[PDB]
Design a protein around this ligand. Structure first.
Ligand code: MG
Lengths: 102, 50, 1342, 552
């Protein structure tokens, strides 16, 4: 709220708008916190916000899953087991045991 | 008529598709209607062999 | 006039007869004019920023007698200019500085001010600015606001026959549509009861408003009905008779007066009986007491003695009721005049359905209609009714509304109050009833007199007005409590409120859209465009075919054949060639006034309603000498139709043969020969032509292309005439002629040319100089061509040799078979400029680095990058190359046992930073033409970014210095000239240093004062240079403002050069599409006896079905054109002489008889003629006017001069077998465009990409596009076939199953083709949504 | 879930769910505080309103989401939509292993295959390529295989030819109507980014080449390969399911070839001679001795299977032309020579394929169909057919007909000035005379255009059906029709003003001549209503199919 107040007068007082670091000296705190504070203060945007064409395409329809694992990768994991398991059968039983242990 | 006869379908999942969903779901949910699939539309929704 | 300098370079041969009386005005007129009126200082209420201010101002507080008025405004210089505003991404705008005056009246006045503080130009907002080309830059992007077409404000009377009630009988309804404020609707019903509804709200009986206007019933009856006087004189009922009242009625009793019986009972009263009464002047007759049984009493009547109401007004009298009012002493009883044919008894029956009685009741019943459910209040009802149509704030018709209103009511004043008056409503009701009565007609919405055209200026005014009202509430709110002298007109007026109203319009609005710039025609045809959609318009779903169709009023105003083909047809159209917005805002077109029997060349602009009654002749007509019509009757149109009209009847005549069409349609040659469907598509596709690498010229043409090139800003036009001092591929400096030069500063005009840069469509827009060192140029000449323009004409493509013949099916449907010669000549090649960006943001895990240190990349990868991590300028790149190195923190990787062993063996340290670096998209390859680095203020600019900043500084200094050097020399060169007058010393003057020249004076004369003038302006430039340099330097060094979270952004610019390949779309102007099928060697190309192959082989089968015959004519004449070229190409290789060439060229430009072209021997016989011939050797440019175009005979005649056959067909030989081809085939030159559908855009393929989070489904996240969408119809297609497994795999494993997909992939590499489908995640999610409600859904049994 | 720039985005349900909790919680608090009735009641109502908004919003107040005017979408609205359940409504879920691009011709193709862009096939079959690369040992492991195809090493191209060979692909167009909208083809590796599509199939897809795009789908599972090959394969649907007539009927260029092939002029090189068989007939033609169309007797051997499951053979001297003799080489076995002995228009050329199917079965008809296309394109190219401006012949009597028809209107007009005929009767009358005139001009240019080739064999004169290009197009069935031809040469129609009436001053000119200002302006309505009507009737048609497939 305190930030809004300064931004009000300084909007027309400065004729442009106070620079991102302008309200910072006016405010008590370390003043680089404006960026951090200004970010968390924003309200999240509705995931159903229609964008473009008026079509059923909605913002949420464009958000990809980043926590999944691509199969072209998962395939290489299942193979690498067979790989290290094969190459560990090529050694002496104690070298295989010692490396499987370490 | 075609649009009237298509209204009545034993499978509610099929009816829930092209008709008004709310009315179909309610009207089915009260009677405890048991959809056996057996049709095309319903099997496509559930994702098994036609 | 009588021919320019770039016309001496090349001249287009023009067939056609009709002289052009008027020439095409500025085609961008509307766009520029509109915004020019919006932002301007106008000392009156004429539309503009002044008017929107004068409406809401002055703003006074609530009763506090503290008023804030408005003085004047100004627009500060733009923060960034167009170029800088485009690069940085900000909006091109000017600060609006407005002086406000705050007056405070002494409390408990007589009104006088304690103090009035004038706040100097308080700043509110930055309003966007329009480019010299009529475009806006919102965020770094050129955007155009399309002019709008809506329903004109005023009154409109409709029918609604048919569908209603299915009884016929029609209906008659009136609608008052204000520019702002609520709607007032009047409508009838099958019972002839007049109804009213405000906006779309509940229906209400019409009369309920009259009571709300403070009208008692007696005055309502007195207003809408006439008075039938009944006299009781002596005893028993005499009556006054106006002899005309008996028309349309049959005698109900013995009609007798004046001792003579005029009509008996049962004899209808015709005009003859009426004549007798009129001529015998019978005022009073005797009537029976039973006739008033139906007659409705006019006013109230009471009993004088008992003071009791005998009968209320508007009540049906009876024989008994007459008795009870008779004994009370009443001589006169007024009744209504009612006739079911002429004057209808409607209003009378409307009162019986009226629930109200008095004014407050009606106001209550209206207020309870508008705001129902809440208790009504007197002040509330009064406030609402006065605020709807009577308040200057909430209601305006403005000028157009009031004018059409008054005009449609047959009033005098064309201008009046902007609100409604009681006289107005009453009058409107009278007109509606008059139409139902049979006198008068209903209008139609589709007429162009009721369709008004807005444009950027008008719309911007409305939005600023909305800004002023939402600021108004605030100003009053603060002035409520205000302290006297502390606050001033600064603390009150804010910026963001006003700035955000206007910003929300230009940024996102249905009328604000990206300019279509792939092409000059596309731009100019976009900037002239009309829309009936958007805010305040109808919608595609809402409105039917009535408004979409072409109307007779469209002539000369809206182009019939240029409109989009699709969801909205006829909802767009385009503006015509000569059309102009009327003074009042309608559409008016040029015409020629025919007085008596002569056709006068005075031009006259007629609006849609103005043109109606006059009889207008035809654009194609034969007149001669004095301009008398040759034929005794000529085809003309007068009122909505066309027929033969007599010699001297016609009031006017069409100005040109073109004016019916639009710039798009006017560029199609032989348009009169093409079916309208294909012509539409032609003018529709003509806008999609991407410019080419080598600008060619159209060989077949119209003659508008010259005008289109200049009027559109793509080219560079001479400001003033003179001789070119300097010509570079960068700039052009012109030395002004003294007649055109202003006295002070002397001068030269310096044109800074645009070089290779990104367009909106990702094409290349690049200017090239068309003039040579030391050449005379005249004002209004093309200095440099833009993209797709050649020597002042408009070239959207390249004409080429085409053969019509089936070639081994490779041309099958529309398919085009193109020789390899074309791709080798690189003529259809296109240059694309794509802007790729790399953003370094801030995450909670840490800041992202642009550093060049990237985990797991070889020396070959890091080669093309500098020390800083940005690719060098000019390095050619392909797919996979790293444009900008970027790395983002992701900590504690959490590896697994076998990955840990892998690193153990190979000893690699897995980084704490992950690689986000921007790499070139798959398959696209080009050369880097530029790099920009924007950095957040306070983060240290890296090495490369500093080099660029230092580079830009030096480059800026060089440019400004170049300016100052040429400028100063140009000025001192004038001082040299003025000193030589009055004191000439030639060799003496240029010896001493030039700086010391300013000391030498002159004898008393104006020449002494001229040296003074040049002195003043010199030093100004010296200082203007200084201040300009400082600002540029500061603009370079200033840290650009970025989005929240982004630390720095690196934008790389790649210029890809694509030529032509199978899959590209190609079409002529005639609506014949095609997609190149095979690129055939020159060896297999059909060739003629001379051995010259053909570039393209078209399939003839496309010509008859789709009727475009122009494409054949364009070919024929085209061939002929090339002939005249080839001939000249031989005579230039012969080097005959100026005489021989001149003869042949003259021969071509005449061509046998009666054309308007004229020609030479005024031209210098050597240097000017030889240059023209050199430009014609490629081909002889021909101009076919739209409907005035050439004729078969002329084409065949030009073919005789060509040496080529009349048939236009020759023998061709297959380049494969070498044997002849049976029958002759048509060969010629067709202009062909390359549209950008290009096959390496459309082409997409995906194996396994990213997936959507909300529903697991294929989605492109890398620009590796998500898979194709399999729809309902495709499912049915699989269902008709017996394929179950294809369908299951389609909607389960290939898409929606988060398990089945991976279990499938592992099987595909293992070599086992199976599917372990599982349940699609969509349905599995649907279960939870149902289960999220009170519904238990289970999967039973087993 | 978070976004770039540190901003967050979330579903509307949270805003709703949050509310239901708060008020609920508040109510619980309000119980332990012993609040007055008027409050806990209001709180109960508020809780009721909040739950309603969560379940189905819009049946009471339509609550709006935070900071955004647009009402927040509730669970009933998540299921609901257009229409009903998007989970398999249009449209319709995204699918892997697919692609798309502009399509081109490729006339060389057999009917069972299609040209596939190299890059498309690489990115599409990526897992198969990976699996195949290490089955033969060209790649050490799956990763190395990825690196190989990502490097595009020259060796991978041959492995792709293996995995493509027997592995059908599904092709689809934008407006899928009947089952032929998707057909299976055999991939043929093709350089370039454009899809090549067999010409004979262009009829079933209703796919022009004017820039229409098609989509490809890979049939992954084995059952899909055998479904595509045994059901969705191109060669297995040669006949429309709507009616047994072949939908693979040759379209335009091919039928103009065969029309020009079997046709006869009056006098031509090789007229009257005799040849042993089609082999030396083609040898006569290709060498340039004999013309493609000339009346000639040649010995042919036709076949009739009219025995019991057994092909009879019979040889005779048939009176035919050179083209029909050459064409006979294609006709397999038991078809009689009578089928090719005619002029072979588009109608007869279809029943040829039809009879061939109903007699010899499936396999012979396929190879037959291919051959017809190949020979059609080739010979059509030899023919050198074209269209010039002089190919459209206007009647010499046109202006005179217009004048006579122009007298009728002035006759009837004089009758209206004198009141002999009523206004309405006049309109019909004038309109009637103009209509008759149109028929006259149409049936004039039709006679002239059709037969006017007048030529000489050994005598003075004779006249046959014209060899003029545009007539051959219209006669064969390739393209154009008497209506469209009539608009080219003879006058075109009487247009109609928007209200539906028809203007009594028709278009007296045509496309070969110029149209003036008025005629084009009047023509505009027909165009605009045509485009509008088709674009609307297109939508109407689709809706009908919906109701139909729903009811069945
Ligand atoms: Mg198409």
């Amino acid at each position: 709220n305190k930030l809004n107040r300064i931004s009000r007068q300084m909007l027309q007082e400065m004729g442009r708008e106070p620079t991102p670091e302008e309200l910072a000296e006016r405010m008590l705190m370390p003043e680089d916190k404006i960026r951090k504070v200004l970010k968390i203060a924003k309200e999240p945007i509705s995931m159903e916000t229609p964008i473009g064409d008026d079509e059923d395409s909605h913002l949420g329809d464009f958000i990809e899953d980043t926590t999944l694992e691509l199969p072209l990768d998962s395939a290489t994991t299942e193979s690498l087991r067979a790989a290290t398991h094969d190459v560990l059968a090529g050694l002496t039983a104690r070298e295989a045991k010692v490396l499987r242990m370490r | 008529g075609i649009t009237k006869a298509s209204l009545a379908t034993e499978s509610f999942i099929s009816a829930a598709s092209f008709q008004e969903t709310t009315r179909v779901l309610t009207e089915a949910a009260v009677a405890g209607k048991r959809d056996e699939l057996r049709g095309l539309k319903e099997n496509v929704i559930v994702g098994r062999l036609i | 006039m009588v021919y320019s300098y770039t016309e001496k370079k090349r001249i287009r041969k023009d067939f056609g007869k009709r002289p052009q009386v008027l020439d095409v005005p500025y085609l961008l007129s509307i766009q520029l004019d509109s915004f020019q009126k919006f932002i301007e200082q106008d000392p009156e209420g004429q539309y503009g920023l002044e008017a929107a201010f004068r409406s809401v101002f002055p703003i006074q507080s609530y009763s506090g007698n503290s008023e804030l008025q408005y003085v004047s405004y100004r627009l500060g210089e733009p923060v960034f200019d167009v170029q800088e505003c485009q690069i940085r991404g900000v909006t091109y705008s000017a600060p609006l500085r407005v002086k406000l005056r705050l007056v405070i009246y002494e409390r408990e006045a007589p009104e006088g001010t304690v103090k009035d503080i004038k706040e100097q130009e308080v700043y509110m907002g930055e309003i966007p600015l329009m480019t010299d080309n009529g475009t806006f830059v919102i965020n770094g992007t050129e955007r155009v606001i399309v002019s709008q077409l809506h329903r004109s404000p005023g009154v409109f009377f409709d029918s609604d026959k048919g569908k209603t009630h299915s009884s016929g009988k029609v209906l008659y309804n009136a609608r008052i549509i204000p520019y702002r404020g609520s709607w007032l609707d009047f409508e009838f019903d099958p019972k002839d009861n007049l109804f009213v509804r405000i906006d779309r709200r509940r229906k209400l009986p019409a009369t309920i408003i009259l009571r709300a206007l403070n009208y008692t019933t007696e005055q309502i009856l007195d207003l809408f009905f006439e008075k039938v006087i009944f006299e009781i004189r002596d005893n028993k009922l005499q009556m006054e008779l106006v002899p005309e009242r008996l028309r349309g009625e049959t005698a109900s009793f013995d009609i007798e007066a004046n001792g003579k019986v005029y009509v008996e009972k049962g004899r209808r009263i015709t005009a003859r009986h009426i004549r007798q009464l009129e001529k015998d002047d019978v005022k009073l007759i005797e009537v029976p007491v039973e006739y008033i049984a139906g007659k409705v009493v006019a006013k109230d009547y009471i009993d004088e003695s008992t003071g009791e109401l005998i009968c209320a007004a508007n009540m049906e009298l009876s024989l008994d009721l007459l008795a009870k009012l008779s004994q009370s002493g009443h001589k006169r009883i007024e009744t209504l005049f009612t006739n079911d044919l002429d004057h209808g008894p409607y209003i009378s029956e409307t009162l019986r359905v009226d629930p109200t009685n008095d004014r407050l009741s009606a106001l209550v019943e209206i207020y309870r209609m508008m705001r129902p459910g809440e208790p009504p209040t007197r002040e509330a009802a009064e406030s609402l009714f006065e605020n709807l149509f009577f308040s200057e704030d909430r209601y305006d018709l403005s000028a157009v509304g009031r004018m059409k209103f008054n005009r449609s009511l047959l009033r005098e004043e064309i201008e009046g109050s902007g609100i409604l008056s009681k006289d107005d409503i009453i009058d409107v009701m009278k007109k509606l009833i008059d139409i139902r009565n049979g006198k008068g007609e209903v209008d139609d919405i589709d007429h162009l007199g009721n369709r008004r055209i807005r444009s950027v200026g008008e719309m911007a005014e409305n939005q600023f007005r909305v800004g002023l009202v939402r600021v108004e509430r605030a100003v009053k709110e603060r002035l409520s409590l205000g302290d006297l002298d502390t606050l001033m007109p600064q603390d009150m007026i804010n910026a963001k409120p006003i700035s955000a109203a206007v910003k929300e319009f230009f940024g996102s609005s249905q009328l604000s859209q990206f300019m279509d710039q792939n092409n000059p025609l596309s731009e100019i045809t976009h900037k002239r465009r009309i829309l009936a959609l958007g805010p305040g318009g109808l919608t595609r779903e809402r409105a039917g075919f009535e408004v979409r169709d072409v109307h007779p009023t469209h002539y000369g105003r809206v182009c019939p054949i240029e409109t989009p083909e699709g969801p909205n047809i006829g909802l767009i159209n385009s503006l015509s060639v000569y059309a102009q917005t009327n003074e009042y805002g309608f559409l008016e077109t040029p015409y020629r006034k025919v007085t008596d029997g002569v056709v006068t060349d005075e031009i006259h602009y007629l609006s849609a309603i103005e043109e109606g009654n006059y009889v207008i002749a035809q654009a194609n007509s034969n007149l001669d000498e004095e301009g008398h019509f040759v034929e005794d009757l000529v085809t003309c149109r007068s009122k909505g139709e066309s027929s033969l009209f007599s010699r001297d009847q016609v009031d006017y005549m069409d100005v040109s043969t073109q004016q019916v069409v639009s710039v798009g349609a006017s560029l199609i040659p032989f348009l009169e020969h093409d079916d309208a469907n294909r012509a539409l598509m032609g003018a529709n596709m003509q806008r999609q032509a991407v410019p080419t690498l080598r600008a060619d010229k159209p060989l077949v043409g119209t003659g508008m292309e010259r005008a289109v090139a200049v009027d559109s800003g793509v080219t560079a036009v001479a400001k003033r005439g003179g001789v070119v001092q300097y010509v570079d591929a960068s700039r052009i400096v012109i030395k002004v002629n003294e007649d055109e030069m202003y006295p002070g500063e002397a001068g030269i005009d310096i044109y800074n040319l645009t070089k290779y840069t990104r367009s909106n469509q990702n094409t290349c827009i690049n200017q090239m100089p068309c003039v040579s060192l030391g050449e005379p140029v005249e004002r209004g000449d093309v200095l440099a061509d833009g993209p797709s323009t050649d020597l002042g004409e408009l070239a959207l493509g390249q004409n080429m040799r085409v053969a019509f013949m089936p070639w081994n099916g490779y041309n099958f449907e529309d398919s085009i078979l193109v020789s390899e010669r074309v791709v080798q000549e690189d003529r259809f090649t296109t240059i694309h400029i794509q802007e790729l960006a790399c953003v370094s943001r801030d995450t909670k895990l840490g800041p992202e680095e642009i550093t060049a240190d990237i985990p797991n990349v070889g020396e070959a990868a890091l080669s093309k990058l500098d020390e800083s991590g940005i690719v060098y300028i000019g390095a050619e790149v392909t797919g996979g190359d790293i444009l900008v190195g970027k790395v983002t923190p992701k900590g504690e990787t959490q590896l697994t046992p076998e990955e840990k062993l892998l690193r153990a063996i190979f000893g690699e340290k897995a980084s704490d930073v992950k690689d986000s670096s921007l790499r070139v998209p798959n398959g696209v390859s080009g050369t880097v033409i530029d790099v920009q680095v924007f950095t957040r203020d306070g983060v240290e600019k890296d090495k490369r970014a500093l080099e660029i900043e230092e580079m830009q500084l030096k480059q800026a200094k060089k440019d400004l210095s170049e300016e100052l050097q040429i400028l100063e020399a140009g000025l001192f060169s004038r001082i040299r000239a003025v000193l030589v007058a009055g004191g000439v010393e030639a060799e003496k003057l240029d010896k001493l240093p030039r700086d010391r020249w300013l000391e030498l004076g002159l004898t008393d004369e104006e020449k002494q004062n001229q040296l003074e003038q040049l002195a003043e302006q010199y030093d100004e430039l010296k200082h203007e240079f200084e201040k300009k340099l400082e600002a540029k330097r500061r603009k370079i060094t200033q840290g650009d403002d970025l989005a929240p979270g982004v630390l720095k952004i690196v934008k790389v610019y790649l210029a890809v050069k694509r030529r032509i390949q199978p899959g590209d779309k190609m079409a002529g102007r005639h609506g014949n599409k095609g997609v190149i099928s095979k690129i055939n060697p020159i060896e297999d190309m059909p060739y003629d006896e001379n051995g010259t192959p053909v570039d393209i082989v078209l399939n003839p089968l496309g010509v008859p079905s789709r009727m475009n015959i122009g494409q054949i004519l364009e070919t024929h004449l085209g061939m002929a054109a090339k002939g005249i070229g080839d001939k000249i190409n031989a005579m230039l290789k012969q080097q005959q002489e100026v005489a021989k060439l001149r003869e042949f060229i003259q021969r071509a430009y005449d061509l046998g008889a009666d054309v308007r072209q004229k020609v030479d021997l005024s031209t210098f016989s050597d240097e000017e003629v030889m240059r023209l011939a050199e430009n014609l050797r490629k081909g002889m440019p021909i101009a076919t006017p739209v409907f005035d175009g050439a004729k078969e005979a002329e084409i065949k005649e030009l073919l005789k001069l060509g040496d080529l056959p009349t048939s236009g067909q020759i023998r061709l030989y297959d380049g494969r077998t070498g044997e002849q081809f049976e029958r002759p085939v048509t060969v010629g030159y067709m202009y062909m465009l390359k549209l950008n559908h290009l096959v390496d855009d459309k082409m997409h393929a995906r194996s396994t990409g990213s997936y959507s989070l909300v529903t697991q489904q294929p989605l492109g996240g890398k620009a590796q596009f998500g898979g194709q969408r399999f729809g309902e119809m495709e499912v049915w297609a699989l269902e008709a076939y017996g394929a179950a497994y294809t369908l299951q795999e389609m909607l389960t494993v290939k898409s929606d199953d988060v398990n089945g997909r991976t279990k499938m992939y592992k099987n595909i590499v293992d070599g086992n083709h199976q599917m372990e489908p599982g349940m699609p995640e969509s349905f599995n999610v649907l279960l939870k949504e149902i289960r999220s409600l009170g519904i238990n859904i289970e999967l039973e049994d087993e | 879930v978070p976004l770039d720039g540190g901003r967050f985005a979330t579903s509307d349900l949270n805003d709703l769910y949050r509310r239901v909790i708060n008020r609920n919680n508040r109510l619980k608090r309000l119980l332990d505080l012993a609040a007055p009735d008027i409050i806990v009641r209001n709180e109960k109502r508020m809780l009721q309103e909040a739950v309603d908004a969560l379940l189905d919003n819009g049946r009471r107040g339509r609550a709006i989401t935070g900071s955004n005017k647009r009402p927040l979408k509730s669970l009933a609205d998540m299921i609901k939509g257009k229409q009903g359940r998007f989970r398999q409504n249009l449209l319709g879920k995204r699918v892997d292993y697919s692609g798309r691009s502009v399509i081109t011709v490729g006339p060389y193709l057999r009917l069972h295959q299609c040209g596939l862009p190299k890059k498309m096939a690489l990115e599409l079959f990526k897992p198969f390529i990976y699996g195949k690369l290490e089955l033969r040992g060209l790649a050490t492991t799956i990763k190395a295989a990825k690196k190989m195809v990502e490097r595009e090493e020259a060796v991978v191209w041959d492995i792709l030819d293996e995995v493509i060979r027997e592995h059908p692909v599904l092709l689809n167009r934008a407006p899928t109507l009947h089952r032929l909208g998707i057909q299976a083809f055999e991939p043929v590796l093709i350089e370039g980014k454009a899809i090549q599509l067999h010409p004979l199939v262009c009829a079933a897809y209703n796919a022009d080449f004017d820039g229409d795009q098609m989509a490809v789908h890979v049939p992954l599972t084995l059952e899909a390969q055998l479904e595509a090959r045994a059901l969705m394969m191109s060669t297995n649907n040669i006949l429309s399911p709507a009616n047994g007539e072949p939908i693979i009927v040759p379209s335009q260029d091919v039928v103009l070839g065969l029309y020009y092939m079997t046709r006869d002029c009056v006098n031509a090189k090789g007229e009257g001679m005799v040849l042993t068989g089609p082999k030396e007939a083609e040898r006569l033609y290709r060498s340039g001795l004999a013309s493609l169309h000339a009346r000639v007797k040649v010995r042919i051997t036709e076949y009739e299977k009219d025995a019991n499951g057994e092909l009879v053979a019979k040889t005779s001297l048939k009176d035919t032309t050179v083209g029909r003799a050459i064409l006979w080489m294609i006709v397999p076995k038991g078809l009689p020579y009578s089928i090719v002995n005619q002029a072979l228009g588009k109608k007869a050329i279809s029943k040829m394929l039809n009879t061939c199917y109903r007699i010899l079965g499936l396999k012979p008809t396929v190879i037959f169909a291919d051959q017809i296309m190949y020979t059609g394109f080739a010979y059509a190219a030899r023919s050198g057919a074209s269209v010039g401006i002089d190919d459209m012949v206007i009647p010499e009597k046109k202006h005179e007909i217009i004048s006579e028809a122009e007298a009728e209107v002035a006759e009837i007009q004089e009758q209206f000035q004198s009141g002999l005929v009523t206004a309405g009767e006049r309109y019909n009358k004038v309109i009637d005379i103009w209509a008759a005139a149109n028929d006259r001009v149409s049936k004039a240019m039709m006679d002239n255009l059709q037969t006017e080739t007048v030529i000489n064999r050994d005598g003075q004169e004779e006249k046959q059906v014209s060899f003029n290009s545009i007539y051959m197009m219209a006669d064969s069935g390739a393209r154009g029709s008497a209506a469209q031809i009539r608009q080219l040469a003879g006058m075109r129609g009487l247009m109609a003003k928007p209200d539906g009436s028809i203007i009594e001053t028709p278009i007296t000119a045509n496309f070969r001549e110029g149209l003036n200002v008025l005629q084009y302006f009047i023509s505009t309505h027909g165009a605009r209503k045509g485009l509008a009507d088709t674009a609307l009737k297109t939508a109407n048609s689709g809706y009908l199919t919906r109701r139909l497939v729903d009811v069945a």
